[PDB]
């Protein structure tokens, strides 16, 4: 219970609301309290219970519990929100306090758009030349930040994989690619292979299995 | 009467023994013991806490409300006999206590002498 | 043949210097291609190398600690002198020294082929950890028992001296062995009376003859029985609740206290003081113990006071035993199923759900007792708000999907309840 | 710091293979080593240049290179080989030198079994109820240590999820369970949600979606 | 109108106490629940809880840090101290005030409504006492050129004093300004000859009367041209080598000579030394490189030394630039499908990878210069190889990919390649 | 002669001024800087340079190697009054250099003094 998680980051066009959880064991049977940190100031509080809300902060601002986790709901997000949003609660039983990692509301520009992964298998034209890589596409997507993860029946892997950095388009949306590079003896063994692409917040995933498919 | 050099040699050994005491200092105990005073360990006891100054040996504050500091004598060996003695795991020390072992701790060696020398 | 043998210091304190000193015989630095060097290991990590000398006059050291280590060579007589100079209580390992061997010219990358044995280095914690003071049963207690304070750190320390404040010398001294990593003395007052109200604390040393470390924390002991009139202690709800209520503690009584304590049996928790109003002639206090769950459970036992006499408490209360447990609910089945009948799997995964009851037995059974085999009852799921949930699925085969009956029975007896529920496939 | 990482930890059975690769930036142009240090004693030198192996050492090890990682491959693990493994190389500019965090190959005294994953959408007179319960089931699965990690429409979901520690089971493997509770309208909100489990590096994922049943 | 206000040292030694004060305005410390605490926030990270201590005399602090924390309230004076006691340098950052207060008397757990403003709290990094010394240009020298060592510390020293082994008198003395806590001085060696040469050593102090430092590492300072023998460098292969094979340079001389000194022109490491064995006719000792890269380019100069006078050389050898060039490589083309079945799918995407090219411009164009209906070409990849990769993706309505037929066209002109390829779906 | 008190008086004071001589000093100048001698700074220098002991200021080394430590001029006036004076901020000095130095800032006090009785 030590540990109270959060998102890493958040981000939301202009008037979508943005949901900010705060995860823990000890929020079961212990109050929780929502504070605001603007860049270069000091911590406002806004929220000090599971539900209730001071008298200054505005409308947007209201708070909800559901078992083990409470959640923000910045309802409304303007461009006067961007800041970073921490979390109190205690120890299981009644003690020490704690503060989340806290998450950062940020306003984007052009509305948010997901990638579209397309995964190729190696040609029957590779294995001849002794040869078998796994081309991953990655196109039309905002803001530029992804991560790819490949993975060989779930296990993850690290040997091979080879990811470019993002790039503008012609449409002020990137694009990236990432390649696996593979001899044709483990291409003929494991059953299925992923590219996994996680966005701002996101898991794309695409599938490709050599047997099944070829 | 060939005991009264007997008396005085066990316990001038006994007490470098077990405290580890000087040998240029074990004798100045003689000067305050003679031939009737040594069956009872008390006065040895009152001696050793008058002379070898064992006073010395525990923290004591400056002022009062402040942090300790070790006692004037603490290099001494008789703080290190005390100290390996007395201390150690499971053992507690009082201000009063001290003089009560150490005169328990006499009565042995004091009895040592009577039961050898027959 | 090639062997290593390190020699050296073991024990050093905070600020001081290691000096090891490396051994070697079989080889000597003079052959082209060859080096010593130090590698560092802490209890239980992962390997970190820290410096290391070639067959020449060059050094290489480790870019965080290049302005505290300083390695040297003899060739004359083999040896080689590696010197740490700020150790601190994280640099403690087993320190290695090893061959060394150059992969070619060109790019000084090495392989460290004949390793020494081990070399156990601790380093002495200084004295500025604080001594930790707590007492048992309870900071509170009558004038005929005795108390035992324990006092511990985490830093080795081999003498601990206790204090009362308001007393010129030092109360009690004692000393503990240092075990693997805590010590821990146990001064046991005597038989307590009136004078032994005030705020203890104790103090830390490696021996009788060194700096003692910063002061524990002040502990208040409080001595009960030493005024006249009583008071007493009642629940404005009913001593049982629902753990889900409100319930509020009431200290009342007459007498001029200005500060009430409210204490939990078998718990060494600090006790609450609240200050007293004066209502209908009634000195009382009133402690809100918002909602309330299955940890509020226990006596709690009021206490009066004054400020005159800080640590002195009026006699205790009658205790007023609280019992806070949910009330049973009775399961609510739900019918669960795949909605998605592939064709290409020959078992089903057809189950039932039992969701809310808080007294734990259940049990679920199909078809009325029959179908032993393939039947899986997952256990109880304790939900945060109190009550539990269960599941229990069977793997009835493809072809026995169709006009074949199943039905789950459960049962609860503390709530006499028996329901039916029939998971027809969609 | 050091710029070499390592899995934290491999288990395999008796008899299988077992694969620790260590990628970093520098193992580009500079060799790699292995070492193995069994509990207490001095690690001892077993392939070096990435290819060659020591004269005494048996033949059951062997190492490769992969780009930017070495892996070094033990081929019918016994109960002797229970050590920890580092692999060594020089930074970029080749002076100064690097090890690893090192994995723990441990051999498990009964095979190991993948978990069987099934999960349950909320019946359909639960939405006449309000309450929606989604159900992940996990079964037979050794050793225990399981990580359900619920996902909606692709972004993680930590709000409802209440989850048992695995437990013993009539026969000699663990299992366990997991449930999310959800509002209706956030169950027809979302297209697909899908319990996912970790189990020892490996990962299954078991998906249902509200179009499908409701 | 409840304000906080923080104050205290801003810079603290590392190894030292902090001190920091809250006065606060507005509300008494003695009213029921209330408290004051202390929260850490590391420039960037999230907030860290410190200390507490409500109305009562109840302290809690962080279970990591309970040993060093301590926290002290004076009610009349309105001042709460806080003296965290060990400062390593990554407990930096700006520290609040705050004022806490309880929820409910059930649990001591708070929020913290009006906080402080912060005060930046910064620790030294920590001091080396040994100075570092280093020479410009080079260790190698010229018989005929002044020299100028560099004794250089930060730790705020006043005065330098050099020494040459074998020497009992100290060569020169020096001073500096303690600028920001940094020193340096630059000894200047005047026209150098035979006997200049040896292992420089400088020292440190904070003035005159001081107790000096711990030595520095020794610097060696090697002459030239002392001898009359002359040597030279040849490489075995070309001297333009192309990437991987693994080059070996040569060091011939035709006296009897004992150790080659191999240095690089640029700013290197340090030189490397090697023994000589005797040959057909001529001293030699040779240098594998092992498999050159873009690194190992440069002009290269072998040096001849003897062990009678360790310290001195023969002239310099004829330069020898190695220049190190990526051959270019021909792209091969391989053709990606969707896979054997994209089924309901309105549009499918088809696809050339082209794989392993050097010179960097690539261009494919699908179809000759038709089907610019959505070719994207994405960026390329510069594998570890050194070998750059590229891919083009047609998206196209499905029912065409059974009659439209879709071929690449990739023109890699440095290597004057034209390749075309067919993919199709099957 | 009358110049003879005069130059006598104004070179002890430019010698005791720039280098905080002792009172005493002055005095046993007096008895060696004798008129036979106030025409010459070589004579002085190495008057000054071994009558106080300049020499030891500096540092030195007990073994062929081993750290340097101070001298014997570890506390007196005349060493930190030098080493205040030419150890500056970029100044050098080595064992040669110092009498140089010293011969040229008392040749310079000598002559304006004498110049200025002129
Ligand atoms: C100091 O007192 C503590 C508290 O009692 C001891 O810890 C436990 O003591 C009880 C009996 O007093 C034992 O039954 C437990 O086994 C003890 N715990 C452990 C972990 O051993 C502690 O042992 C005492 N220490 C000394 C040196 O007397
Ligand atoms: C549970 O009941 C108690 C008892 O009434 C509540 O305590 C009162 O709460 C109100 C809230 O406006 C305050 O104005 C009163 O001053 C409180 N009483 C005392 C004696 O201080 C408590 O708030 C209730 N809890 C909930 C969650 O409703
Ligand atoms: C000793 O070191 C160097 C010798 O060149 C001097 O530092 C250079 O001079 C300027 C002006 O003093 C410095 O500000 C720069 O750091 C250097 N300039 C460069 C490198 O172009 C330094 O002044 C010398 N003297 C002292 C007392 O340090
Ligand atoms: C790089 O090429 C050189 C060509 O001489 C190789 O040099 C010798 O290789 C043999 C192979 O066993 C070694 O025994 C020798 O010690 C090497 N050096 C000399 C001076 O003969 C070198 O091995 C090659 N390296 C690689 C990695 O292929
Ligand atoms: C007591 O401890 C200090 C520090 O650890 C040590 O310097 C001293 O020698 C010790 N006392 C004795 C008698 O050894
Ligand atoms: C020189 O430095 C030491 C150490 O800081 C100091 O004690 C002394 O006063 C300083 N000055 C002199 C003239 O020694």
């Known amino acids: 219970s030590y540990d109270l998680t959060q998102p890493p980051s958040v981000s939301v066009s202009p008037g979508q609301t943005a949901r900010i959880t705060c995860?823990?064991?000890?929020?079961?049977?212990?109050?929780?309290?929502?504070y605001q940190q603007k860049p270069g100031q000091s911590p406002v509080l806004?929220?000090?219970?599971?539900?209730?809300?001071?008298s200054a902060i505005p409308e947007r601002f209201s708070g909800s519990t559901s078992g083990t986790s409470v959640t923000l709901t910045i309802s409304g997000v303007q461009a006067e929100d961007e800041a970073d949003?921490?979390?109190?609660?205690?120890?299981?039983?009644?003690?020490?306090?704690?503060?989340?990692?806290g998450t950062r509301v940020s306003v984007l520009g052009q509305p948010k758009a997901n990638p579209t992964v397309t995964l190729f298998p190696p040609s029957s034209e590779e294995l001849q030349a002794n040869k078998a890589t796994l081309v991953c596409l990655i196109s039309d997507f905002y803001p530029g930040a992804v991560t790819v993860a490949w993975k060989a029946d779930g296990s993850p892997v690290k040997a091979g994989v080879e990811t470019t950095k993002p790039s503008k388009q012609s449409n002020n949306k990137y694009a990236a690619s990432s390649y696996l590079s593979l001899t044709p003896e483990q291409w003929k063994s494991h059953r299925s292979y992923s590219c996994q692409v996680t966005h701002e917040g996101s898991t794309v995933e695409k599938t490709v299995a050599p047997t099944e498919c070829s | 009467a060939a005991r009264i050099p007997a008396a005085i040699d066990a316990v001038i050994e006994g007490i470098k023994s077990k405290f580890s005491i000087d040998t240029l200092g074990g004798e100045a105990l003689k000067s305050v013991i003679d031939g009737t005073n040594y069956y009872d360990a008390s006065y040895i006891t009152t001696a050793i806490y008058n002379k070898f100054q064992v006073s010395s040996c525990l923290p004591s504050v400056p002022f009062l409300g402040g942090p300790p500091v070790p006692g004037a004598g603490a290099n001494k060996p008789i703080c290190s006999a005390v100290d390996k003695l007395y201390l150690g795991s499971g053992n507690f020390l009082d201000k009063s206590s001290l003089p009560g072992s150490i005169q328990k701790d006499v009565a042995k060696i004091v009895a040592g002498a009577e039961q050898a020398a027959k | 043949q090639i062997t290593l043998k390190e020699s050296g210091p073991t024990l050093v304190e905070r600020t001081q210097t290691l000096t090891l000193t490396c051994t070697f015989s079989?080889?000597?630095?003079?052959?082209?291609?060859?080096?010593v060097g130090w590698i560092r290991q802490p209890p239980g990590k992962a390997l970190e190398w820290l410096a290391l000398?070639?067959?020449?006059?060059?050094?290489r050291y480790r870019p965080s600690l290049k302005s505290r280590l300083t390695i040297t060579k003899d060739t004359s007589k083999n040896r080689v002198v590696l010197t740490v100079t700020d150790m601190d209580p994280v640099d403690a390992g087993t320190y290695f020294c090893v061959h060394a061997s150059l992969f070619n010219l060109g790019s000084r990358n090495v392989y460290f082929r004949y390793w020494g044995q081990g070399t156990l280095v601790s380093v002495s914690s200084g004295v500025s950890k604080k001594p930790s003071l707590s007492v048992q049963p309870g900071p509170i207690v009558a004038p005929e028992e005795t108390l035992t304070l324990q006092c511990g750190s985490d830093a080795g320390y081999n003498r601990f001296v206790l204090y009362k404040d308001g007393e010129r010398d030092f109360l009690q001294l004692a000393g503990a062995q240092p075990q693997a990593g805590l010590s821990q003395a146990n001064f046991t007052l005597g038989p307590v009376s009136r004078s032994y109200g005030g705020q203890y604390r104790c103090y830390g040393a490696h021996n009788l003859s060194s700096e003692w470390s910063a002061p524990s924390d002040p502990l208040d002991i409080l001595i009960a029985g030493q005024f006249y009139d009583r008071v007493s202690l009642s629940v404005q709800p009913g001593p049982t609740v629902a753990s889900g209520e409100n319930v509020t503690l009431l200290c009342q009584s007459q007498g001029w206290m200005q500060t009430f304590l409210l204490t939990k049996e078998g718990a060494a928790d600090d006790p609450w003081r609240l200050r007293s109003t004066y209502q209908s002639q009634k000195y009382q206090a009133e402690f809100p113990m918002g909602p309330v769950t299955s940890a509020h459970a226990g006596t709690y036992r009021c206490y009066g006071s004054q400020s005159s006499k800080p640590y002195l408490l009026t006699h205790p209360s009658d205790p007023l035993e609280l019992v806070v447990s949910a009330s049973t609910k009775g399961p609510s089945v739900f019918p669960l199923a795949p909605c998605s009948r592939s064709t290409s799997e020959s078992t089903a995964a057809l189950g039932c759900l039992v969701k809310d009851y808080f007294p734990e037995p259940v049990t679920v059974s199909w078809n009325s007792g029959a179908l032993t085999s393939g039947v899986h009852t997952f256990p109880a799921v304790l939900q945060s708000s109190g009550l539990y949930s269960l599941s229990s699925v069977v793997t009835v085969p493809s072809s026995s999907l169709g006009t074949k009956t199943y039905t789950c029975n459960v049962d609860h007896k503390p709530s006499n309840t028996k329901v039916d529920k029939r998971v027809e496939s969609k | 710091s050091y710029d070499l990482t390592q899995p934290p930890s491999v288990s395999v059975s008796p008899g299988q293979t077992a694969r620790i690769t260590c990628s970093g930036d520098?193992?580009?142009?500079?060799?790699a080593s292995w070492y193995q240090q069994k509990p207490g004693q001095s690690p001892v030198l077993l392939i070096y240049?990435?290819?060659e192996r020591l004269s005494a050492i048996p033949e059951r090890f062997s190492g490769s290179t992969s780009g930017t990682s070495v892996t070094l491959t033990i081929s019918g693990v016994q109960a002797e080989d229970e050590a920890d493994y580092f692999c060594?190389?020089?930074?970029?500019?080749?002076?100064?030198?690097?090890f690893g965090t090192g994995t723990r190959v441990s051999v498990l005294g009964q095979p190991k079994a993948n978990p069987t994953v099934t999960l349950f959408p909320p019946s359909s007179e639960e939405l006449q109820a309000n309450k929606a319960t989604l159900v992940c089931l996990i079964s037979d699965f050794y050793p225990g240590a399981v990580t359900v990690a619920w996902k909606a429409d692709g972004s993680p979901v930590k709000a409802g999820v209440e989850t048992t520690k695995p437990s013993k089971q009539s026969n000699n493997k663990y299992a366990a369970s997991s449930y999310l509770s959800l509002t209706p309208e956030q169950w027809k909100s979302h297209r697909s949600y899908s319990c996912q489990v970790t189990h020892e590096g490996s990962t299954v994922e078991k998906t249902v979606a509200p179009t499908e049943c409701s | 109108q409840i304000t906080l206000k923080e104050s205290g040292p801003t810079l603290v030694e590392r190894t030292q106490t902090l001190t920091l004060t809250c006065?606060?305005?507005?509300?008494?410390?003695?009213?029921?629940?209330?408290?004051?605490?202390?929260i850490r926030q590391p420039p960037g990270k999230a907030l860290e809880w410190?200390?507490?201590?409500?109305?009562?005399?109840?302290?809690?602090?962080?279970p990591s840090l309970k040993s060093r924390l301590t926290i002290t309230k004076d009610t009349s004076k309105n001042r709460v101290v806080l003296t965290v006691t060990d400062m390593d340098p990554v407990d930096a950052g700006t520290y609040f005030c705050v004022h806490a207060s309880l929820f409910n008397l059930g649990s001591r757990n708070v929020y913290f409504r009006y906080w402080g403003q912060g005060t930046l709290v910064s620790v030294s990094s920590g001091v080396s006492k040994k100075p570092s010394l280093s020479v410009q240009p080079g260790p190698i020298v010229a018989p005929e050129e002044t020299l100028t060592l560099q004794c250089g510390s930060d730790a705020g020293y006043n005065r330098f004093v050099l020494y040459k082994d074998g020497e009992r008198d100290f060569l020169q003395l020096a001073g500096a300004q303690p600028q920001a806590g940094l020193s340096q001085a630059n000894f200047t060696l005047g026209p150098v000859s035979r006997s200049y040469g040896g292992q420089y050593r400088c020292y440190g102090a904070h003035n005159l009367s001081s107790e000096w430092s711990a030595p520095s590492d020794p610097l060696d300072i090697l002459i030239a041209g002392q001898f009359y023998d002359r040597v030279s460098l040849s490489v075995q292969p070309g001297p333009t080598v192309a990437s991987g094979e693994n080059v070996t340079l040569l060091c011939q001389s035709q006296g009897w000579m004992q150790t080659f000194l191999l240095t690089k022109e640029g700013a290197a490491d340090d030189p490397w030394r090697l023994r000589s064995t005797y040959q057909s006719q001529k001293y030699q000792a040779e240098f594998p490189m092992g498999p050159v890269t873009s690194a190992h380019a440069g002009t290269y100069r072998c040096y001849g030394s003897q062990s009678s006078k360790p310290y001195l050389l023969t002239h310099p050898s004829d330069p020898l630039e190695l220049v190190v060039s990526a051959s270019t490589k021909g792209p091969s083309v391989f053709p990606l499908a969707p896979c054997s079945r994209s089924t309901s799918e309105s549009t499918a995407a088809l696809g050339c990878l082209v794989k392993d090219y050097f010179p960097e411009p690539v261009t494919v164009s699908w179809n000759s210069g038709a089907l610019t209906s959505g070719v994207h070409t994405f960026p390329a990849v510069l594998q570890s190889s050194g070998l750059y990769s590229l891919s083009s993706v047609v998206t196209v309505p499905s029912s065409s990919l059974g009659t439209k037929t879709y071929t690449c066209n990739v023109d890699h002109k440095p290597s004057n390649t034209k390749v075309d390829k067919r993919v199709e779906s099957k | 002669a009358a110049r003879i008190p005069a130059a006598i008086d104004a070179v002890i004071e430019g010698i005791k001024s720039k280098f905080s001589i002792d009172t005493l000093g002055g005095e046993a100048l007096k008895s060696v800087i004798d008129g036979t001698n106030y025409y010459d700074a070589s004579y002085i220098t190495t008057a000054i340079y071994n009558k106080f002991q300049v020499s030891s200021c500096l540092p030195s080394v007990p073994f062929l190697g081993g750290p340097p430590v101070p001298g014997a001029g570890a506390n007196k006036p005349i060493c930190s009054a030098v080493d205040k004076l030419y150890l500056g901020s970029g100044n050098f000095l080595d064992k040669s250099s110092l009498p140089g130095s010293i011969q040229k800032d008392v040749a310079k006090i000598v002559a304006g003094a004498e110049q200025a009785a002129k």
């Open positions: 520098s193992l580009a142009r500079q060799f």
């Open positions: 000398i070639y067959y020449d006059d060059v050094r």
């Open positions: 060594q190389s020089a930074d970029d500019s080749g002076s100064y030198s690097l």
């Open positions: 079989g080889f000597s630095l003079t052959t082209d291609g060859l080096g």
């Open positions: 240049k990435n290819i």
